[PDB]
């Protein structure tokens, strides 16, 4: 099922998007006086919270580099979080067509 | 083994260069960050500069003079610092430490003895 | 950037009894703090790595506590081996910064 192929391939793109934007924070926001998120650890963290959105607000960037990188974890957490909805949309529509006799 | 191996010393004649080379063995990441310490005679540590050796990037202490170019080799996996326009007041011990990107200096270098003088 | 501040420093103390050094941000920096120890003619050594957390190595006589704005790092019962400098350094906001450091005396 292609709803099904979608929504694993979102889900292992969203991690690698997690992964690689919490290494790329720390990158780009080191060197910036202020700056917080400049460890990778808490980095991981506050990808998640950002692409869930949520967003706590304890880690923010501050560079421009660094919010590029924020806009690019919430577009691939909206969209996957908004695949997987549009993934259950279909087995559920689907699964009504059945038991109707559609 | 020893993760940071640094020269015993440095001569440098006023106004001239020098090269520092900081190389390290032990476990490497891509998260890895090399920094350098300053500590003159008598005076306490001082941060100069770091730099992420699996991307090049390296970023400075703003707070002080700029005084030295952090360079990085993944070849060999040493470090350098490049001193320029050397006076009395960059005569100091130079650190190299290692960094695993969770912000505390696991390693250090047994430091390098930078004298200038004529 | 975050200031660290220690004080007094120099501390003395008599053999075999606790000691604790003093470290104060200029702002709030949870418990990203970490203590190093020099010897004469020696590189600085991990003591205590995020305020309290302790290092393999390092003998339990060392220990760390505090959070926020002030720091505190701890000796059971000091010994001649702790002759030596105390740093502590932040690693909160970019970029990393060291205290003025504290030298440890010991009353024999």
């Known amino acids: 099922a292609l709803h099904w192929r979608a929504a694993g391939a979102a889900t292992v793109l969203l991690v690698i998007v997690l992964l690689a934007g919490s290494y790329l924070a720390v990158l780009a926001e080191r060197g910036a006086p202020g700056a917080q998120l400049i460890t990778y650890p808490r980095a991981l963290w506050w990808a998640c919270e950002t692409a869930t959105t949520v967003x706590y607000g304890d880690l923010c960037p501050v560079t421009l580099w660094g919010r590029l990188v924020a806009v690019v974890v919430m577009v691939a957490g909206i969209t996957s979080f908004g695949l997987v909805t549009a993934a259950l949309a279909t087995w559920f529509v689907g699964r009504e067509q059945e038991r109707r006799g559609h | 083994q020893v993760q940071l191996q640094q020269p015993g010393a440095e001569l440098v004649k006023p106004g001239a260069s020098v090269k520092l080379s900081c190389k390290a063995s032990?476990?490497?990441?891509?998260?890895?960050?090399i920094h350098w310490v300053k500590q003159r005679p008598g005076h306490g540590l001082e941060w100069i500069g770091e730099?992420?050796?699996?991307?090049?990037?390296?970023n400075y202490n703003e707070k002080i003079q700029k005084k030295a170019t952090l360079t990085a080799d993944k070849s060999s996996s040493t470090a350098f610092m490049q001193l320029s326009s050397l006076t009395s007041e960059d005569s100091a011990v130079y650190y190299c430490?290692?960094?695993?990107?969770?912000?505390?200096?696991?390693?250090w270098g047994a430091g390098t003895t930078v004298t200038v003088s004529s | 950037d975050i200031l660290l501040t220690q004080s007094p420093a120099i501390l003395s103390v008599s053999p075999g009894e606790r000691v604790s050094f003093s470290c104060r941000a200029s702002?709030?920096?949870?418990?990203?703090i970490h203590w190093y120890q020099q010897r004469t003619n020696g590189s600085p050594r991990l003591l205590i790595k995020?305020?309290?957390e302790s290092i393999s190595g390092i003998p339990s006589r060392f220990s760390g506590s505090g959070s926020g704005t002030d720091f505190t790092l701890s000796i059971n019962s000091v010994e001649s081996e702790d002759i030596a400098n105390y740093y502590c350094?932040?690693?909160?906001?970019?970029?990393?910064?060291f205290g003025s450091g504290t030298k440890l005396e010991i009353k024999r």
């Open positions: 730099i992420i050796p699996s991307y090049g990037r390296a």
């Open positions: 702002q709030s920096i949870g418990t990203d």
């Open positions: 032990g476990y490497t990441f891509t998260s890895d960050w």
């Open positions: 350094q932040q690693s909160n906001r970019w970029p990393f910064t």
């Open positions: 430490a290692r960094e695993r990107g969770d912000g505390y200096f696991a390693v």
């Open positions: 995020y305020a309290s």
